[PDB]
Ligand binder design. Structure first.
Ligand SMILES: [Cl-]
Ligand SMILES: [Cl-]
Length: 162
């Protein structure tokens, strides 16, 4: 199991523009296109993102290409972030995957906002961090996915994904 397979499980793969859990236009493996309510605004961003007139539909390779860019950007965002970087450097390989997953889903800004949990992760207080992470809109809105990530941070294994 690695970050790619983990995120592929959490986000699924759709080749036609769809609406995410928040109602925003998305495509591929969790690639947010726009928060705008306009489907035309979405197709436009999609075409700009792929470099061709897609008419709202892409191939598997194109989805995979977006996904590789997105995980790359997630990692790089963590490393450039003053609040995140230290947490990431402190963690083992599996738990690093869990932090990357949160960032990919909610953005660097969003994650950087979990001040207390980040401090607990940094100190390796696993059970405490898991309890604090659950007190969030994130957990209440996407509980099954949050539970998986939380279990990953608590145990340091891929059990929730197996
Ligand atoms: Cl893009
Ligand atoms: Cl969920």
């Amino acid at each position: 199991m690695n970050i790619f397979e983990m995120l592929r499980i959490d986000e699924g793969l759709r080749l036609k523009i769809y609406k995410d859990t928040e109602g925003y236009y998305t495509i591929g493996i969790g690639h947010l296109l726009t928060k705008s309510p306009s489907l035309n605004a979405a197709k436009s961003e999609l075409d700009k993102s792929i470099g061709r007139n897609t008419n709202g539909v892409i191939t598997k390779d194109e989805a995979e290409k977006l996904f590789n860019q997105d995980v790359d950007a997630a990692v790089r965002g963590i490393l450039r972030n003053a609040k995140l970087k230290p947490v990431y450097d402190s963690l083992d390989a599996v738990r690093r995957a869990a932090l990357i997953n949160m960032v990919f889903q909610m953005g660097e800004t969003g994650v950087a906002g979990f001040t207390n949990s980040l401090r607990m992760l940094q100190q390796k207080r696993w059970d405490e961090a898991a309890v604090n992470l659950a007190k969030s809109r994130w957990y209440n809105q996407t509980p099954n996915r949050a539970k998986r990530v939380i279990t990953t941070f608590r145990t340091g294994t891929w059990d929730a994904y197996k």
